[PDB]
Symmetry: D2
Amino acid sequence: HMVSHLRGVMPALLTPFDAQQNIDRASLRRLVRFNIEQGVDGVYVGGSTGEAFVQSLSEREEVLEIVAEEAKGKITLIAHVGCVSTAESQQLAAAAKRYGFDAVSAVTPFYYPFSFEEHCDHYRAIIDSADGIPMVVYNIPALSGVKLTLEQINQLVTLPGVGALKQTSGDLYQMEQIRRAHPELVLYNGYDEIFASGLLAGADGGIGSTYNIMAWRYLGIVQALKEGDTAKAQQLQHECNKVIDLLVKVGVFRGLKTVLHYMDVLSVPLCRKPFAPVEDKFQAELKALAQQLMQERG
Amino acid sequence: MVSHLRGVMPALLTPFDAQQNIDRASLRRLVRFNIEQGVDGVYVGGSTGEAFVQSLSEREEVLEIVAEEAKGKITLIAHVGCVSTAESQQLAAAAKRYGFDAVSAVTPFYYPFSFEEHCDHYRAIIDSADGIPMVVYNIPALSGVKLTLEQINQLVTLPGVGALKQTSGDLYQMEQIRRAHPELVLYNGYDEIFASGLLAGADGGIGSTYNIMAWRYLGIVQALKEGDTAKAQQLQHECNKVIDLLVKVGVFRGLKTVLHYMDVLSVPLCRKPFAPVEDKFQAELKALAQQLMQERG
Amino acid sequence: MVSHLRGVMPALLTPFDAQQNIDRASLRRLVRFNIEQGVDGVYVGGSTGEAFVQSLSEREEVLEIVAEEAKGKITLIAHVGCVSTAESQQLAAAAKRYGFDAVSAVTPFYYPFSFEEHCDHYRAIIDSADGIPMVVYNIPALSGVKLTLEQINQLVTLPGVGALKQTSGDLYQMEQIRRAHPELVLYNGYDEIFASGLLAGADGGIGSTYNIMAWRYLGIVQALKEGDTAKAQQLQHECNKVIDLLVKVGVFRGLKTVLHYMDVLSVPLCRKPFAPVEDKFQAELKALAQQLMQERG
Amino acid sequence: MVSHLRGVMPALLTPFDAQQNIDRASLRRLVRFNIEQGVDGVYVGGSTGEAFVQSLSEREEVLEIVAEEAKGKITLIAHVGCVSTAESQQLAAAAKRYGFDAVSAVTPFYYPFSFEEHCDHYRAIIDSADGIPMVVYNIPALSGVKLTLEQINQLVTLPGVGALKQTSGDLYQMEQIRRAHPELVLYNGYDEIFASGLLAGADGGIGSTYNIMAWRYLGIVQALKEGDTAKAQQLQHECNKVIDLLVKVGVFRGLKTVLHYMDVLSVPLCRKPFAPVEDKFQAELKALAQQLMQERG
Ligand SMILES: [Cl-]
Ligand SMILES: [Cl-]
Ligand SMILES: [Cl-]
Ligand SMILES: [Cl-]
Ligand SMILES: [Cl-]
Ligand SMILES: [Cl-]
Ligand SMILES: [Cl-]
Ligand SMILES: [Cl-]
Ligand SMILES: [Cl-]
Ligand SMILES: [Cl-]
Ligand SMILES: [Cl-]
Ligand SMILES: [Cl-]
């Protein structure tokens, strides 16, 4: 109850790159202000959506500082500092601390098969480098490849320093089990395509990549469920999933950046290689989506 | 034209006696018990009914008994699915003779069959059903058949198919199916995500835990219709508490034990290789029964 | 003291007729065809035998005929496995009356059964087998039962177990089992890694492809004993050229089609939902039959 | 014209100091130790080398040190693989400057990239390699990239590819790759099936356990060429007893610990979050080191 300021809808911030795949500091600032203007509660910087695992530590630090300049004091700031290496993760956590972030986050170290105790000592070290700001633990069985148990999840979110769990799992039975076991836990829905259902299962918020282009739709699902308007929440989720269908067809990250480009937010919609660029045949649909979303705002 | 198939329908358990033979007397009382709960229908002879440890003659016996007890009072759905298409046809013809409202068949399992072979499998059963609608399966877990949206479209649009039993925890696919087929009858398969399943697109449910607490699931439906999301969450919590226990003791045998302490079933045995419930769990299961009975009224 | 179970033993196909009834005459011809190939035994009523689309009466009949044709001439192994323990026992007692040298039971599948429930399942079947040895299964793929080395030790050391049918491509586990059980009879399940499976610890195999080319697998066994690792490799190449084709056309139905062109089977049909072979593959399958026939003599 | 890339090559470990910085002195001694074992080459900066907890600058430091010690003495292969293509190109250009005989890149992981995106990734590295052959991966396990035979046939025919590191236990695919590409340089990835992997088609190996007992694997290669299948099995048995121990304690840290008790590495630490070896395992790991040292003289 002492870290209640971490609840809400927070876009997983994309990292804009230039024509040579270097950070586009100018576009990054505009994206932070664009999200603030959507009414989001916070911003999740340097995550998987931010293409952190194709950036260097110095680059991820560069992004963390720019976002903190634009957003500190305006919306909640969460820095994803996770690496495979515990020392590299500690470097980013100390940096987030220096920049004034409200919390840090770390994906379960992946690739190599680490024991559960190793995962805990990994979070304990990062939490120490965070030097007093809460940790948002991860439970992503899909991409990371770490299948956990309820009692393991219960041990993670009880570590001294953990103040939230980012639940990137479609298993809403486990979502309900987590909520039932930890009534006060800040619990982010990680899959935008089941946002409405994730909230009903126990989540009290979300962190998603598609929030960068239509965060108001997800804010509206929250409003609808609070109001008892299940039909409105369903219709909103249908629309979000029409978009996600398109983003899956064309590439989620590059598709979102392309929409933000046609929205005149990002100057370059590139992802870093080996992400290929968007195919020409998809450009017409993505531009029309931008016009739809911009007219839908006001 | 098949809106009479929507609703909450328990996946019926098949009661056995001390020697693991069908307990006809307890089977009739179980049907009565579910009818007295307010269910919209009953799903007979499914995986919950231990159909794949019974004979064709035994599954027909259960079908005929349930039809006698329920036909004309609630919707009757007969799971006629086997691996063999011919065996599945035999039970479809029997359900048609017994006056069932619909048939159902699990995707042929164990052997790897092509999608075309699945569709022909259903066509053969739809033919022996002889005018009653078919409920198809999308169960990627136990059966081991991972499908695609376009493949789901071809199944639900087969002439004769009238509903889809969605036994999947992926509520993105649930939504995609509802978006593609607004009028489709869509059963949520996993009771533990029932409330989320409805919100994702399901308009009903077929579950094994309905046998002991159908009113909770019927309550979730009402709560979401009335816009009482808080109430729906509370009910799903209580359902998932029970499911936590049933998973610990054994789902089917735990349900039968609760029904035994409810004085519905005389013998809560499942058929071997299912072991019986451990003695150390009997106290909790009896306490659960007493709780559900007092909660009823 | 059960070393007579080691060797190459074809997994027997179950021939059917035009109306998908059991073809008793083609069955006898197949048993005689395999005995001419020089196999060490026959594995009856298995997954290759399409046991799970047959009735208990049908499987008992196939067991009895194979016994009439082969008893006293080659080793007889009866797969009696069913999901139901009682059903498995009935077939176990039947194989005992028919004089089979051993029985086998796939790990009960579909439903999630504890490892202890698997062991009791095997105990019950071994008791009904009344003194003939049991062959256990470690088939993680089709059955869906992922086991542990220690669990494998408990199974193969059960009173009555005399062999293990290892249907797993994990040849690390194959080596661990041999290292832990130097005298255990150990069959390689996947024919496409037969040579590598033997080198990892297996002392035999049970394969569906042995029905059309057992001599190649018998030659691999001989090549490895002689030290001609080149011959074993080339023999495995040829077996996998064929397995490549069978995977493309359908393994069971493709094997029967070859046997049909060999004049062994009258109808190369499997039972629905298995579809028949596409006409476009008939030329290739016939050309393989002539190659295999000319190859032998 | 890439036959010089065949043979047994240890996946070099990266020694660290008490402060987990690179231990240059122990690295050089490890390269000399492998060279003294009779290996055909060294695989530097791979998964075994803990490349994914190091920095680009650190991996370059290792590549250059090894090239100083080994160039002109054994084949040098630098694993330049990163998720990022640009980062992989930087290390590929550095391997070119240091005179490596070939580069290698694991399939980019974590993010789901299309197969075409994988090829352009490899194409880009081959260009920065500036003329030295590429070794592509087929590792479906850790990386999470399940490929197809035709996709494998496209990767190993890319201009610049000269070998394939087959890190898969599926020895059916191994034989298929060998049959489709008779001349391909093909490394067996899993040490626990090395003998069976060679028999299936592989003509070499890249393994982490080679750092402490390469002569056993070099002996398996000799035993098979000699036709002494019995000896090959015995060697693989002994190798798998070690691997059983290494799995229990942690493969990388266990290998480094054995190398520490061999007075090769001064510090057996892996980088966090890898924990150190537990004290209760030290006695065994020291006994293993003593066994291996007496074994080779
Ligand atoms: Cl993210
Ligand atoms: Cl784990
Ligand atoms: Cl809510
Ligand atoms: Cl704008
Ligand atoms: Cl069911
Ligand atoms: Cl009757
Ligand atoms: Cl006859
Ligand atoms: Cl079989
Ligand atoms: Cl007869
Ligand atoms: Cl004939
Ligand atoms: Cl490696
Ligand atoms: Cl060789």
